[PDB]
Structure formats: C-alpha cells, structure tokens
Design a protein around this ligand. Structure first.
Ligand code: CA
Ligand code: CA
Lengths: 245, 252, 253, 249
C-alpha cells in the first residue's frame, strides 16, 4: 500500500565471490539513510523478509534497508577462498550506490544490525570499516572464548585462544576510531547470554560506547524483531511503530 | 530452518483467465490445506509481505495456498475476467496435479481472508460446500449499510466492473445472504472485526443475517482498526480452532 | 557472470491502479539509455524473461531494460476502472526515475518495443508521450479495422467492451493509432516487423500505410514468419542493432 | 501459455547444508520422467532459466526439470564442511519426492545433464549413484589432468584446496571421473559434447577416451564452438532427443 516500502529482489554478479549472488532492498516511498540488516547462521538475504514483519515495520519510514547474503561464511574472508567480508563490506555498497545514487554516503546516516552470526558480522563491520554511526546486535555470537571441526576451520582456521586471535571483536576493535554507537540485546535464557556478557564488558573497557540490554527471552525470531523495533527508535530517522490496541 | 515451511512461488497459466498467473504455497516439513485470501490493493504476495504467517506455520502440518484475484473481488466480473471460476475451480485442480498429497477432504480443507478477501472467503465457502472452516478478518461482508465512497475506495466504473449496477445489495445475487442459498450450512463460519473499523456495522449486519438464515457463525470483535496487525493476530486465533494441532510461538 | 546485467524484480505500489504491482529491470553491469519492453496479451512483466533470451542478449550492453505489466488491459485506461495507460506511461517512469537517477531522462536515449498487444501499446505510448526516440512493434496489433479478435476467438465480447467500450469503427475511434497520432510531434522513429503468415499482417500493412500518409517516419519490414516468440526474439535482436547503444550479437558458429 | 511448463521457485531448508536453500522446477502442465539440470561455476539454480530458452524448449514435453544449486562447491562434499554432494545426490531427491509423488522413482526415467562444472557434477552423480539412465555433459570440466584453472583465471589455490584438497595427480585421485567410475555399474548412458575451440576440449578428449577404455557407453560429439551458453542450449536440445520422452523439434 501507500507508504509501504518498495521491495527490490536483486540478482547481481559478485566479482569478489565470482558468483551470481543476491541481495534484497527495501526502498522508501535525497541523501536517504541506509540500514544494513544481517542474517544469522542457516539464513540468507531473504531471512529478515521470511522471518519478521520488517516490511510492515518500515511503513512511512525514510530508510533504505539492505539485506546481504553471507551463506554460512560468518561475514569473513574464509580459509577456502570465499571472500565474504570483502564482498559485503566493500563490493556490495559500491554495487548498490551505482544502482541507487540517492542512498546516503554519510556515516551519520549509515546503520547496521544483525542477529546471532549477524550480530558478530554487524559488530565486525562496524569496528573494521568506521563507516557506520549505529550498530546493533540481537543475541549475537559475540565471543567464542567460553557445525563441524572442518566447518569451523573453514571459517576461522585453527584457533588457540579466541579473544587474542584476529577474529575476536576485541582484536577487531583495534581498527575502530570508537565513534560508532554500539547497541546490544540478549535474552537471559539464551545460550549466548554469557558470551554477550563477556564481549560487552570487554568492549566497554576498551573505551567503546555500548548500550547493552537484556530481558526474558530465548534464541528466537520473535525477540529479534522486537529488539529491531527498539533499535529503530534510537536512530535519527523519526520512526513510529504501528498502532497496537 | 528445520520445521519451517518450504515456500513455492508458482508461475502457471490460467486457462480460465487466459493469463500467465501466479500463486504462492507454503508446504510443511492427506495433508490439510488452508486457502488464504488477500484484500483490495493486494495480491498473492500480500500475506507473505504483510504478516509473520511464514513464522506462524513453523512445525504445523498445513499447506497454505495464496491465490491472486487482482482487485477483482473473487468474482466473475462484468469485463470478462472470471476470477471466481479461476480461483474456486481451476486453482484447486492445478495444485492437486502438482501436490497429490494435499487433502481432498472437506474436514481438512479451510479458507480465510481479510477485507475483500473476507467477502471472497465466505463466498467460496457458501458456494462450493468444499470447506469445513471459513474465516473473515474485517471482511467486506455487506454493502447494504456501507458505501465504498465513504472511504474513497475505487470509483463508480470500478464498482460497476465488479458487480454491475446494484439497486439493493442484500437482494442482489452478489450478497452473502443470496449466495448462502447454495450452501448446505455445514461450514463453520468464523469472523472478527475491530470495533473502530469502518466495516464494523457491515460485519454486524451480515453476521446477524447469516445467523438468522441458520448458519453456524462465530463472531468476535474487540478494539481495533483496519490494519494488518489485527488480521495477523486474528489468523492466530482462527488457527487454534482448526483440527491441526497448532501451537503459538513462545512470547515472554 | 561478469558483464551480465543485474536483474531487479520490483514490488512497488501503484497509486494509479490502487494495487501492489510489479516490474522487472535489467540493469547493466551516467545517463544510461533505457528500453521499455512490453508484453502481449496473456502475458505479464515476466514474459520477455520467461520466453526469450533477452537476458543473455543484453550481456555487455549499456542499456537498462524495463519490463512493465498491463495484465490484459491493452495499455489502456479501461472501462472498468483500471488506468493501465496512466500507470505505465506516467507513473512507472516517475517511480523508476526516483529509484534510478542514473537512468537517462533524454528522448535520444529512451526507447520502447513490444510484441502483439505490446506492439499496439508501444506505438500508443510513442505517439502520445513524445518521450521516445525509437519505438518498435513486433507483429503488433496495430489496427482492428481489418482484424477482428473473432477470427481466432481471442477474448470475449465482455472483455473487448471492458477495454474499448462499444466501437462503431476502429480507425475513427480515439483508440486507433491513427487517432492517437494527433498527439505526436512526429519526431519518433517508428519501426515495425510482421510475419507474412501472421493473422495481424494486413493490420500491420494498413496501420503502416495510414501512419506514412500522415507523415510519420515508419520503417516496416516483413518476411516469412508466424505469431511466435522465436520471431519476436529475432526481431528484438534486429531492433537492438539499430539503437545508439553499441550492441553486438553473441557468437554463433 | 497452454502447454508451457509451470515454474516453481522453491525455498526449502537443507538439513545436510544447515542452510535455507533453493531449487527451481519446471513441471509439465503418473510416473513423470525427471531431468536434473546442473549449473556451472559462478552460477546457481537460476542459471538455466537466466541463460537459455529452456522454458520454451520444454513446451508440451512430459518431463519435470529440476535445477539444483551447488554454489561454487563442485557438487562435492567439500574440505570446509559443506556437503554439496550429499545435499544434491541424496537430500534434494527425497525433498522433491515428498512434494511431488507423481515424479518417477524409476532409473529408466531419471536423467541428468550439466555444463562445465555441471558436466563434472553430472558425470560424478551418474557414476556414483547408479540412479540415472542417461547423463549429459556440455563443455564439461571432465578432467584436471591436462587442464589448469589458472590458465583461465579460475578460482585460487585456496579455493581449489577447499574443494579437492591437495592433488598430486588428478586421474589417480579419488576425485577423478576415472576413479569415481569404480562405483558405477556401467548401466548409465553417458553423453558429451565439447566445442573444438573450447579451452576444455583436450580435457574432454582425455576423459572420454579413458571412460571408453573403462567400458562405459559414451556418446561423444564435437564441433565448432567456444565456452558459451549459445552452444550449451543447442546441445541440451540434441541430448533431449536421445531420451525416452518423445521430445519434439
Ligand atoms: Ca515476508
Ligand atoms: Ca529466463
């Protein structure tokens, strides 16, 4: 309907991945603000569309939403020759800006959010690029300090100590100018609650602006959507939630 | 994920419409079937675009079929598009060919719709006698006491395209009351409307008339307007009335 | 692969149609030329992608291709309240300009093409908008003066009345290309092909004759051929070689 | 139109890959024959739909066409934990059989074809499963004994290691079609075409020679052509004429 976002289901060639690849875009209704919205493990670019009311949530909101695909590659340039980090941090923004010149190129209007694996990817991209002003993690896999062996090796190689490896958010934080607002939620009955506690505590000590919340909840889409609703209210976009009598 | 429905987006040729046409189907991980009908301005993508129906169906043994009537009111129109025949007769035949494991039993065959889709839902239930349960969410269930111009909906030519010239709605062949003559009364009818919906009085009237005709109608109403948030909530309630062992997601 | 166009399946709201609606876009891999490519009766915005190799054809070509949907409404503001002409001639270009500012807004680089019902729609939009430099019809339904849908039992009386109302005489009705031509500045290069074994061949001969009499720039070609996708695909290939876009046909040894 | 195949674009969960995954199906519009149609490198389940007139080709043909996705994984259970072979050889057919009970479960009505990487994957599935009666390769990557991907700027050392591990000699490796052929009952008709100007021409010549030596029924053709979709579409047409489906043109 009127005020609902247009939806762009995009098939594009990734030179970085040497693959025909996919992204979804929600386009409002120029310097239009952008939110990158990252899926978790087992997911892809369709996840937020399949698993939440993000479309309804974006009604009347001047915000472009970009949903990338990392296909179980952890937003990482992998050991097996698939450069997912490069494809999504570098190539995708270039591809989209070419299609959509009215999308903002300003940090203060560029945001990121993800759930689980996407929570890790979100914080990683926020810390390494310095191109985002706000970054949100919902039940993120924020630390491995506390699949299959071949699978995990494919992502991270051999890991002795997670926190001191270049893959930890603590280590990636060294690349950050610390000017990104970080936002995190985790359910208190989530298996990743303690990983979130450790990562948040570390990032705060390292001097980062981290707004961490936690409440009753488990590792489920209902909660991640609810927390996206909360995160959107923190953005400079004048968001309004639907009436719910 | 595991237990989530498969989604198939189907491009098929409608011989009835003489059109390339489309439908969406959710297929679970003699399987019951729910036909889920869109409203005005909508199409076969509406329920997927506007609700968490996909997430709602996790772990539930139910095929969901989403047809498209493209603003044609689930009606064989005045302008040569036989949408009723295409969706009531052709689509079920097409899908049965693809999906032989879909039930052919009335007791396992259901339909639901919102607004124009609530009208279409009750029309199909009353005319076919092939459904056991039929639900309307803020349905356009009568035009006797509701005029679309009060809400700047369509135009005189558009309405004439669907229904022709209508002197009196209820006594016309298009009313649910008139269409009810084709019904064996053995379909459970289920309706909700928000008390702040422009269609509240239309629902009140149609429900009273169908009950007076001896239909089994379960009508509920509460705070609410003409919005997707409510239709999604009421689909959730309706699913609990079906013989499908549905359980809602955890919400702490 | 590399050099292949990106494909955009677009779900947008049409205020004109009061509908959730759709279009497909091929976007080359900056004032980029655009071709609007119109489907025929029984088709939709998916037709050219489903029924031809247009995607493979556009490899390495700097041209955006827009495939709209008129859903059997003849690119016409109908008698039953669906304003397909306004939706496609007016609203769609505005919607696309907003999404794609790098798409050209110049007549010199804006083109249109269509098969059958889409050939009619193509010439109609070319004549009435003055926004296109080149317009191509493939086996177009260019006249109903000497063609009747009753010859092949296409549609139904109610269907045709739904599109055009009651017509005494096609050529003198406001729906004819001959009537619609009055809105044209005559600056569009019109291009038409029709197969000699097509039910629409004489309709093409007549429309072409009439438009040339009115002083239009019309290039008309015909050869053995029938009312089939094989021919429409072949003629699209020919049309692309005529456009100011550096098109090169794939190798076929 | 009338007689054209229905198209279903399918999103399903792959337990084997722990992925939301995809396949396309053309369904003719009862024991219906099935063709698995495999994409090449850089492609996916959409490849044959995007790059050919396969839809038009199948008008009036009683054949289901299944297009899987191996996402640059070479139809192989990889060294990095993605079991593409198992997902496509075992899981996908079980998934589709559940949706479509009218699809054949007979070997004599089950066929497979692929281009490039898909030619390799096709012959691999045919040799290993013994569940197909006819298998076709179009410009297939049928051997790496005499072809190095580096010559065409394809992949990277890390990429190839991810698929095949370290390879001292291709033909004697368990990954070669020659080695995979040990699992075959030889009761699958193999069909191959390659362009005489294709960079994979010599790889085809070698694999065909070897499979013939091993006692396989291999129909191999070659003519003018390069590594392009135009040729693969034409050759799919020729392959269809060899199938027990009364294909028309
Ligand atoms: Ca959705
Ligand atoms: Ca295609």
């Amino acid at each position: 309907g009127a005020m609902d976002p247009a939806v762009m289901k995009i098939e594009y060639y990734s030179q970085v991945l040497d693959m025909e690849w996919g992204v979804n875009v929600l386009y409002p209704d120029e310097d239009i603000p952008v939110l990158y919205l990252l899926h978790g493990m087992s997911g892809n670019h369709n996840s937020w569309l399949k698993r939440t009311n993000v479309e309804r949530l974006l009604r009347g909101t001047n915000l472009i939403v970009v949903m990338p695909n990392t296909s179980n590659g952890w937003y990482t340039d992998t050991q097996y020759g698939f450069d997912y980090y490069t494809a999504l941090a570098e190539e995708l923004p270039q591809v989209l800006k070419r299609f959509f010149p009215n999308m903002t190129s300003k940090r203060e209007k560029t945001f990121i959010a993800g759930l689980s694996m996407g929570g890790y990817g979100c914080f990683k991209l926020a810390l390494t690029t310095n191109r985002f002003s706000h970054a949100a993690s919902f039940s993120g896999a924020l630390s491995f300090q506390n699949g299959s062996p071949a699978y995990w090796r494919g992502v991270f190689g051999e890991i002795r100590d997670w926190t001191t490896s270049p893959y930890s958010l603590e280590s990636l934080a060294k690349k950050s100018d610390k000017k990104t607002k970080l936002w995190a939620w985790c359910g208190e009955q989530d298996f990743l609650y303690e990983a979130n506690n450790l990562a948040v505590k570390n990032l705060k000590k390292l001097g980062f602006d981290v707004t961490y919340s936690h409440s009753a909840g488990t590792h489920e889409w209902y909660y991640w959507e609810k927390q996206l609703e909360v995160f959107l209210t923190t953005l400079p976009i004048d968001f309004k939630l639907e009436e719910r009598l």
